[PDB]
Amino acid sequence: REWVGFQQFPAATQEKLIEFFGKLKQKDMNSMTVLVLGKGGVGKSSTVNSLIGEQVVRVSPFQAGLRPVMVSRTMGGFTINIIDTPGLVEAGYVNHQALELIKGFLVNRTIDVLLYVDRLDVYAVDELDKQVVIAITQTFGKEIWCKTLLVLTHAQFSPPDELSYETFSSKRSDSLLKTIRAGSKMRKQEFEDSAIAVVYAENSGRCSKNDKDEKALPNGEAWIPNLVKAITDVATNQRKAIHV
Numbered sequence: 001r002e003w004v005g006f007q008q009f010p011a012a013t014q015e016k017l018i019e020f021f022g023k024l025k026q027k028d029m030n031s032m033t034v035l036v037l038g039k040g041g042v043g044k045s046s047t048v049n050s051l052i053g054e055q056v057v058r059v060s061p062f063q064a065g066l067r068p069v070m071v072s073r074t075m076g077g078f079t080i081n082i083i084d085t086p087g088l089v090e091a092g093y094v095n096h097q098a099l100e101l102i103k104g105f106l107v108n109r110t111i112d113v114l115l116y117v118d119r120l121d122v123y124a125v126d127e128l129d130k131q132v133v134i135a136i137t138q139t140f141g142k143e144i145w146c147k148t149l150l151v152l153t154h155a156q157f158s159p160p161d162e163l164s165y166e167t168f169s170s171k172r173s174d175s176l177l178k179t180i181r182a183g184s185k186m187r188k189q190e191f192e193d194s195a196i197a198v199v200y201a202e203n204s205g206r207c208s209k210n211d212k213d214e215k216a217l218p219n220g221e222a223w224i225p226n227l228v229k230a231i232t233d234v235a236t237n238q239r240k241a242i243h244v
């Protein structure tokens with residue numbers, strides 16, 4: 001479908017997205033496919049709707065047995081495909097049936113970028129997070145991690161008491177990255193080489209805006225263009241995409 005949501009982005013965001021997608025088109029990539037994975041309730045669907053700028057997937061405090069969905073939008077000969085998914089944990093365990101459904105849904109498809117999504121405003125990683133990584137590695141292979149971005153939602157979180165945002169967020173992202181390294185079995189150099197970048201998101205209607213009317217992080221940066229910059233970076237990193 002035509003990309004109506006694009007028209008609703010502020011000019012400053014439009015400008016950046018055109019630059020990013022324009023770079024892909026120059027390399028004769030006239031489309032890209034983004035897979036989104038995560039536990040339930042972390043804002044996967046919300047982040048998808050933020051990226052498309054339309055209500056294309058269902059958001060809810062409760063996890064609906066639901067199926068993967070591909071949302072596709074096209075503009076000036078360029079097409080973005082984003083695959084939203086059911087959560088990867090159920091009742092304190094990894095949901096392997098969800099993973100198999102997702103994998104089944106991906107047959108024949110080429111995945112340019114994985115977004116592995118979790119919340120910023122969480123105080124610990126636990127064994128379940130590592131098991132989610134382990135299961136993703138078993139389903140798609142170790143190589144998925146060289147095409148992945150860690151996306152942390154609820155970025156407008158303000159930590160309690162004396163704690164700085166920067167200390168809290170660097171600890172949260174570090175702990176997750178170390179979990180990815182552990183669950184993927186990657187050696188320290190191998191892991192450094194995968195170069196997994198951390199991107200922040202705030203899907204709340206109450207998100208701060210910068211002075212160009214763009215949804216902004218506490219540092220003032222426009223987060224939707226940041227995330228698109230990171231996606232298009234990974235899409236064109238010349239590591240091989242993920243075929244299933």
Ligand SMILES: Nc1nc2c(ncn2[C@@H]2O[C@H](COP(=O)(O)OP(=O)(O)O)[C@@H](O)[C@H]2O)c(=O)[nH]1
Nearest residue numbers: 041042043044045046059060061153154202203
């Ligand atoms: N404050 C805030 N709430 C969010 C954010 N992302 C999602 N939510 C809320 O968290 C709940 C789950 O969101 P959803 O997108 O359905 O998560 P999913 O199960 O991972 O697909 C919903 O009630 C959303 O409104 C975020 O960045 N900030």
Ligand SMILES: [Mg+2]
Nearest residue numbers: 044045058085
């Ligand atoms: Mg969802």
